Write a protein that binds this ligand. Structure first.
Ligand SMILES: Nc1ncnc2c1ncn2[C@@H]1O[C@H](COP(=O)(O)OP(=O)(O)O)[C@@H](O)[C@H]1O
Lengths: 165, 369, 171
């Protein structure tokens, strides 16, 4: 629970939640993603006005799609509807982006802004996905990912004292 | 050993291939669209700088074989395929990239027409070259190109798109998304070309005569064949405009310009020991001209112009054939050069090395050796 | 139907059976009586509208007196709104679909992601649009209004059925 300890927002889905350290997010978002199992991640990041959900049912023998997996030094952005996302560490989402069904990415997922993923959007490690559908545009440097993520975490923690609520 | 590279000079597409590769590999549009690029950069950019184009070539080739097969071309040879009329400075700039930047083992220029002949491997043949911007009838008698029998109509695929945009810019018979008649100016070239390329069936000669009648002082142009649109604006108008393109494709109206015209020109430079041979050799090829049902309009115009009074003396009564292509769409020269480069380890000596290019840096065409 | 307490409705909306409205299902059916269908699932963050008022100002003889309707198996997902969509049999609306005003949604309607519906466009049957390619009439028969896309909709409706009983039990 090393996030922004302040009266910011509320949500639900306490199935397999986790309040880890160095991982924080902003307000205006809702968390309704307990449709399948969960996997949170410390040192991550996210912006305001977002939404996330898991893949499908997974209650009966017909299990769901790839619902969720998070990582370290990750950085989500605004308006990113993370629907059915199982990714790794040092991920990077963009503005107005969305995750597609059965998306099973890996570490350092540079999700482009205003991009979305299609059904069964399993991505590889140290990649850079983009497009209306799931499309790995390029790649990403892992060292620069962890370094810039920590630098951004400190810079955001600097201005984090704003809105004492 | 190993494979090789098979790349030709295409304004629209320059595929790559290996040695003796049976079946196509990968086609990509010749223009280079990069990051933060508002409009991609072409290839036919002459009298332009060399460093910027040089760079574009470097990274484009780089990612080209990367996304093709991620191979290391510093290990195998290259089969360069030509397309005449291009400035040799450009070609040598490509070579400059290749050797002075990438250092491949050896490269080798080659004619596309050769590979076209290799599709059948016969000695004498006509050349029904129909490229992307021009055409060419430069026969290969005895497996040897016929020099002065040349000519080109600068009215290929690109100009066809220009014709399309002209016609449709004149009339926007589509709706809004109510008709939006010539409201905006820019066009979706991809959509336009999708309509065009996805609907290229050639019509009857009689229909072309109807078009000619419509030029001055019309019998049922629909059922018109033209492919759906987008942008909330789709329509079903006369697809007969593409047949109008087929009519303007061959103009005799104080122009006397056609493919048969170049065949006649060749005939003018042809000696008696070439005439009947070419009458046999009715070679059926052409790159961009993948025109469905063109046999009708084509053959009809051939056997329509045979009747020209100034050419019966030249022709007589010559019949022709159909030298059908065993290859496909445009893979003809591609796969022709692929199998042509297969066991040409012998000709690997003829493939220009970077070794000699160090002390040389030049490949001579018809110059002083 | 699952008349959720969190499902914010507004106005006279004579709903139909099996219209399970999920939590935070903000809607409006006052200026137009929107009747629900049979076999849908109104998810979270939706936005059902009725008779676009004078902010846009229809200065074209405003004498509407017309109510909205719905159909069977037409479950609309989260993010997407509903700007008086005259739906039908199995017209699913996926995430973030910008619903248009006059779009008579027929059967086999797969409203893809971020696909702003076309105003005053008769949405015919058996047509699934592409995401980035707006108005893509792709899959004219694969996305068939009956037995193919509607069968897939009824198949997706099974998870909605299990979720309907589960949400009725969880509440
Ligand atoms: N059915 C068809 N009829 C006519 N042209 C076609 C048809 N199908 C494809 N084509 C065109 O043939 C062209 C091949 O062009 P090409 O000769 O490869 O250009 P370049 O030589 O510059 O690469 C393609 O651009 C395509 O638009």
């Amino acid at each position: 629970s090393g996030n922004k300890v302040s009266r910011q927002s509320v949500l639900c889905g306490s199935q397999n939640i986790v309040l880890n350290g160095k991982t924080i997010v902003m307000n205006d978002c809702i968390i309704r993603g307990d449709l399948a199992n969960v996997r949170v991640g410390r040192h991550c990041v996210v912006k305001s006005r977002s939404v996330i959900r898991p893949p499908f049912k997974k209650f009966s023998k017909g299990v769901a799609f790839f619902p969720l997996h998070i990582g370290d030094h990750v950085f989500i952005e605004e308006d990113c509807v993370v629907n059915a996302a199982q990714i790794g560490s040092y991920v990077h989402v963009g503005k107005n982006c969305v995750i597609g069904r059965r998306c099973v990415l890996k570490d350092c997922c540079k999700i482009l802004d205003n991009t979305v993923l299609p059904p069964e959007t399993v991505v590889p490690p140290f990649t850079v996905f983009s497009g209306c559908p799931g499309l790995f545009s390029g790649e990403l440097p892992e060292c620069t990912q962890e370094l810039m993520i920590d630098v951004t975490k400190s810079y955001y923690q600097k201005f984090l004292p704003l809105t004492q609520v | 050993e190993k494979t090789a590279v098979v790349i030709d000079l295409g304004e629209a597409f320059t595929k790559c291939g290996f040695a003796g590769e049976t079946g196509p590999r990968c086609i990509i549009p010749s223009v280079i669209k990069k990051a933060g690029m508002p409009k991609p950069i072409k290839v036919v950019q002459y009298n332009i700088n060399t460093e910027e184009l040089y760079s574009y070539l470097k990274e484009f080739i780089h990612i080209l074989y990367f996304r093709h097969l991620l191979v290391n071309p510093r290990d195998r040879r290259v089969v360069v395929i030509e397309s005449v009329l291009c400035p040799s400075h450009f070609r040598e700039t490509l070579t400059r990239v290749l050797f002075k930047y990438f250092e491949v083992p050896s490269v080798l220029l080659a004619p596309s027409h050769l590979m076209a002949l290799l599709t059948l491997g016969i000695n004498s043949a006509m050349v029904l070259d129909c490229g992307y911007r021009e055409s060419l009838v430069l026969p290969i008698y005895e497996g040897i190109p016929v020099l002065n029998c040349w000519g080109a109509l600068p009215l290929g695929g690109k100009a066809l798109h220009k014709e399309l945009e002209t016609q449709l810019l004149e009339q926007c018979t589509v709706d809004t998304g109510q008709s939006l008649p010539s409201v905006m100016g820019s066009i979706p070239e991809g959509v336009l070309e999708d309509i065009k390329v996805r609907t290229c069936f050639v019509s009857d000669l009689t229909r072309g005569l109807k078009i000619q009648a419509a030029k001055f002082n019309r019998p049922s142009p629909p059922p018109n064949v033209d492919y759906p649109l987008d942008g909330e604006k789709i329509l079903h108008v006369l697809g007969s405009i593409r047949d109008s393109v087929v009519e303007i494709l061959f103009e005799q109206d104080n122009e006397e310009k056609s493919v048969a015209t170049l065949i006649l020109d060749s005939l003018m430079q042809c000696p008696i020991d070439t005439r009947k041979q070419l009458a046999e050799n009715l070679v059926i090829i052409g790159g961009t001209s993948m025109l469905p049902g063109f046999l009708h309009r084509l053959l009809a115009e051939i056997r329509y112009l045979v009747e020209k009074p100034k050419y019966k003396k030249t022709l007589g009564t010559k019949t022709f054939r159909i030298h059908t292509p065993p290859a496909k769409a445009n893979c003809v020269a591609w796969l022709g050069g692929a199998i042509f480069g297969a066991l040409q380890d012998i000709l690997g000596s003829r493939s220009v090395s970077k070794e000699y290019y160090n002390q040389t840096g030049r490949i001579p065409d018809w110059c002083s050796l | 139907a699952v008349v959720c307490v969190e499902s914010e409705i507004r106005g006279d909306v004579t709903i139909g059976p099996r219209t399970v409205i999920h939590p935070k299902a903000r809607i409006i059916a006052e200026a137009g009586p929107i009747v629900i269908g049979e076999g849908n699932l109104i998810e979270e963050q939706a936005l059902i509208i009725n008779a676009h008022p004078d902010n846009i100002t229809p200065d074209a003889e405003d004498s509407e007196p017309k109510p909205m309707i719905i159909g069977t198996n037409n479950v609309f997902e989260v993010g997407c709104y509903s700007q008086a969509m005259k739906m039908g049999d199995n017209n699913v609306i996926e995430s973030k679909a910008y619903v248009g005003r006059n779009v008579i949604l027929t059967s086999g309607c797969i409203i893809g992601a971020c696909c702003n519906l076309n105003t005053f466009e008769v949405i015919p049957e058996n047509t699934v649009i592409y995401g980035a390619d707006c108005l893509r009439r792709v899959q004219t028969e694969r996305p068939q209004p009956q037995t193919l896309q509607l069968d897939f909709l009824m198949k997706i409706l099974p998870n909605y059925h299990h979720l309907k009983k589960t949400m009725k039990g969880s509440s």
